[PDB]
Amino acid sequence: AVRVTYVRKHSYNTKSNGIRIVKTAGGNMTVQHRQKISNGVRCGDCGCVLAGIRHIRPHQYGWLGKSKRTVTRAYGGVKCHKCVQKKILRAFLINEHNLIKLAAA
Amino acid sequence: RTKKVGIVGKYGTRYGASLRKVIKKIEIAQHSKYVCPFCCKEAVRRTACGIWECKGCGKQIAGGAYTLSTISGATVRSTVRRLRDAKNSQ
Amino acid sequence: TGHKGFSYKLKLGKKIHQNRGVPQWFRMKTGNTINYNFKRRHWNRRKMGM
Amino acid sequence: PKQVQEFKQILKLLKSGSIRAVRVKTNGENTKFKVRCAKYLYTYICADKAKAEELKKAIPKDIHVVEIAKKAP
Amino acid sequence: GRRTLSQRKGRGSIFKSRSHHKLGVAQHRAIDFFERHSTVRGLVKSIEHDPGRGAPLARVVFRNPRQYGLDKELFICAEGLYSGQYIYCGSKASLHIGNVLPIGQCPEGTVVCNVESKPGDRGIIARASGNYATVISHNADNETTRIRLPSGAKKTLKSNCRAMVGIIAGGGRTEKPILKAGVAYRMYKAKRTTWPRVRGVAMNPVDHPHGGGNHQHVGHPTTLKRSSPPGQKAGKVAARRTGLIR
Amino acid sequence: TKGTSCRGTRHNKTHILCKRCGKRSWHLQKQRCASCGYPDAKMRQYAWGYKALRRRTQGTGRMRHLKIALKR
RNA sequence: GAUUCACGCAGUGUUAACGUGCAAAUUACUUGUCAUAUUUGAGUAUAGGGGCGAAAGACUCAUCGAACUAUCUAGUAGCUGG
RNA sequence: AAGGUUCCUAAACAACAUUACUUGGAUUAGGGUGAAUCGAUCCUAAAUUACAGAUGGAAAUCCUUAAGAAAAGGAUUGAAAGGGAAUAAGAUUAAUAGUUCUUAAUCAAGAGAAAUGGUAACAUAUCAUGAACUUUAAAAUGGAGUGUGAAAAUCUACGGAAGAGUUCUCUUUUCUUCUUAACAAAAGUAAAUUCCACUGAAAUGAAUCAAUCAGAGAAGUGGAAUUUAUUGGCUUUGUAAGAAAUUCAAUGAAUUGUGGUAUUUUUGCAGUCUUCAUAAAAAUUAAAGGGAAUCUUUUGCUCGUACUAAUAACCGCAACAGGUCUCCAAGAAGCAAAAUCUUUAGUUAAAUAGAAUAACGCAGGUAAGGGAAGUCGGCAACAUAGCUCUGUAAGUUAGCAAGAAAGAGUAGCUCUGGUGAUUAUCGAAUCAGAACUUUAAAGGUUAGGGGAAUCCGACUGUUUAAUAAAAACAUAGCAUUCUGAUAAAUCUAAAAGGUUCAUUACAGAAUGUGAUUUCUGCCCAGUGCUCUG
RNA sequence: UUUCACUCAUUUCGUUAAAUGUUAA
């Protein structure tokens, strides 16, 4: 077995100091700097992880294509599909009831 | 399994028979599921001291420290309803 | 340390520069008593305290 | 490094004016046409000699062409 | 001798409050016209756990009635509140659990909580777990109402002092017996530095007035005047009585 | 273990070099110099420290400009 | 905040070694303990009739029943030495 | 971190490393630290400090956004372990290398009436306009335990190619090499979870090691999305064999398959348990609601970078058996990262040796017969010791005591049987049993002495650094006193001053006793405290 | 001198000093 060493000057097993040992030419092993695990977006109301958006760092969303950082729908990145259907029904039904109850009952 | 020490057998033999009895009633009621007032399911479990969450219903309810609804918290709710109806009627 | 400030590093280099002996020609001057530098130090003998 | 999948892209690449250098590597079972562009190093794995000769006629004459074999240059 | 532990407590050293993870100040919203002469509606977005206190906190969200935006408030939960509930704050609000009403509109016998000792000071009385104050009577002659404090004392407040109708959540917290010293250690995670209390009789005469001699005892009466200086005021202060109560 | 053993962990400087007096008397946590009293506008001098007055005062340095003025 | 082993840590016993020592408190075996009242690095806060103390008058740079350093100060001595 | 030139080389050995030294971390003279991508620099945490204001006889103190004609909203500092735009492989030097060279990349800042598809979940090499203002999310969140996906290491199956070791006794034999980066691509193909469409479950079904779920809709069928150390997880591909490794010849030549229902480590995922504990903020980024308006190329500055990191480079007067935070981690055997032995790497010197083999010693041992008669006292030493099976008392808070106590078995060799997968072939260590043999089997190493009572402390924990580790302190439990916040306790010389208090009687402050069970008797004269007098 | 009534110094507070008081609709 080949034993390795930290390449950067950090020497503690911190969250940002994650490393991976991979094999290289001649049987030698090198050290990579691996990336932290991130979370996605959550529905603004029900707090459910949205589908169709990757779980990457906040700045990497800028590198992604314009279509890969959201979903083509009403509110489309902040509310689940269920979160929005409730919003549409609430808007239409309450306005309709506010139209019949008052406003020339 | 056990004759009488049901949930407080994890305390072994080191807190007193009386104290282990008192803590048993509270620990049973704290860990049990309650009927959830908005969807009528045995799906409410405690998440913190005074916060209860309906697992299969998506609601967070404020309640007692260990029971979903306290005896004093139920009489007060009944009392206010009587007061509100009396105020609303003359 | 491996990591040091710029000003601190220059004061480290000067302490290195001042740890030298009397040049031979200065020792041949007429009426010369300065043969050895009594302000000298070595890393394992005295710590410069900086 | 990027890979060119079929023949139409590399010819259009060769006729494109962004090229910088060409190096041809002859392996035991294939021939690779590594076009050194400004940004990437496009390559094309070829196994048919006649298509390779067609490719070799397609390189502009002004371009420095490097021929690589079992001995590296 | 030395300065006793009670003297060292007022200096703001290690005895400072461990309030770093706390949610914030829990209180009513600032009074305005829409609360004095109307009702504003709030939405209980979530119910959270504030470290160091026994009652849950509701993250209520109001709407700004004079500008565009939101008024994110932080109330103390009344028992029975749930996520998505609408709560109305104002002088014309309905008498329901969780609504914020001036103490003059509550009928005699109403159970309220988070009462303001002075109008507009955003909540003083009846804030612990399971606590509440009852309304005793009204007096429209001088616009004052009487309430009964959780300690049993009676207090007279202005009739426009606000309050939340109901019972503070988290009742029955202190009926569960702590069993271990470790559990009591975790109780003061978000509190001040007080827990392991050395008996004064186990101290030395320099440290504490009780610091005894060849037998662990006090020596002098432990009931002391109110006017004793800081340093010798240790034990029972202005004790009208002692011994077990009958 | 109050003697030899306790001195193993002494690897954290309390004082670093000062900027006004040049000595290793700048307390890091206190953010003041124990010798020349830095931040303080006035140089720190005490009448009980009569020797510390003669170690650093007027005439113990170069006197780059005053030597011309007084001779003038 | 169950029983034990290990990396570690402490210091119950030998009242062993050493006792002008490896060491101004350490070594060997034995013993105990070895993750939640746990162990630990850095930063930060608390300073002299003050701090800090699960409390031994313990700790506060080998100094603590009141630190270190300088001035008053060549303090006074019916006492001891010359 | 600390040290500061101790790093490399050459000349030289007066001094120093308890002899010596041609050696040296010692003398003399030179050489040596290369960054757009690693860090500092940027942000904020505990906290810290300014102008004006407030306080003070004074020095100075308080306040940190409240007091201000100051700062859309609040000033400075505070992390080389928290947050954070972007780099890798090979080679190179006497010494530097995510820093130089070759090759190959990435990032930021610049320059040259406004789209489709899908029923839906949602998808489209930039595309396909999107201002003020507002909201949401990310950065950004405890711990335990169980299951499992993938990679690496070790082990192993089939087929080999090259080299090496053993060989008068055998051994188709034993050993080594057979590799691949950042960044991207998309032949082939996974595990887990969440949603969408059709349909409507009872004779209730679906499923996990455990759970858990369903008419606010299960199971089934067909889809969509996200995660799995870069693109998209694994094999594979470009980079890329031209490198590197193993051989051969004298620069040039050869090879570089496919698997495993095995162990460990790492990294994710899914649910379960637990809290009177709920387990950071900002810089910075994106989306949304609203509808105001009408590929090539340039540049990337400042600072650190050598070396030790310790039985010789740090702190203890020193080359001091003391102390000092981390990363990577092979084989045997075993439950075990234990003890013992070995491979890669390191070293054979680390305050001097030679001869003789007296006493008395320090360290490790054994001993006839007796077995604590020694001694203050079984102090020291001896003795038990793993695993399997049988068996296990009084007492008890009914949980324990309990590994109680006590007894038997265990080796080697040759066999037999049980526990599965794929549809006959393949595979795992685990358990049970039977003949035979002997020096009769845990014991090389590691490895509990047991029982009957009495006293104290309930327990886990802490304690006099350097003669006291305990019955002492803490503890949970019990009890008492004061206080409605402009308060109680309490710091300050003063203060729009400070602490509990981001608090509000289920709270804050002050005390005694110390788990549980049973019980707390009489006394208000004396001294305290109090009175609604 | 005591008991009253007020606020105007004074105290304690709250906010983005965001509809206070009296008429009007």
From Swiss-Prot, chain E:
It is found in: Cytoplasm. Residues 206-246 are annotated as: Disordered. SMART domains: Ribosomal_L2, Ribosomal_L2_C. One of its GO terms (biological process) is cytoplasmic translation. Disulfide bonds: none annotated. Transmembrane segments: none annotated. InterPro entries: NA-bd_OB-fold, Rib_uL2_dom2, Ribosomal_uL2, Ribosomal_uL2_arc_euk, Ribosomal_uL2_C, Ribosomal_uL2_CS, Ribosomal_uL2_dom3, Ribosomal_uL2_RNA-bd_dom. Pfam families: Ribosomal_L2, Ribosomal_L2_C. PROSITE patterns: RIBOSOMAL_L2. Keywords: Cytoplasm, Ribonucleoprotein, Ribosomal protein. GO terms for molecular function: RNA binding; structural constituent of ribosome. GO terms for cellular component: cytosolic large ribosomal subunit. Component of the large ribosomal subunit. Belongs to the universal ribosomal protein uL2 family. Component of the large ribosomal subunit. The ribosome is a large ribonucleoprotein complex responsible for the synthesis of proteins in the cell. NCBIfam families: PRK09612.1 (NF007180). This is Large ribosomal subunit protein uL2. It comes from Entamoeba histolytica (strain ATCC 30459 / HM-1:IMSS / ABRM). The lineage of its organism: Eukaryota, Amoebozoa, Evosea, Archamoebae, Mastigamoebida.
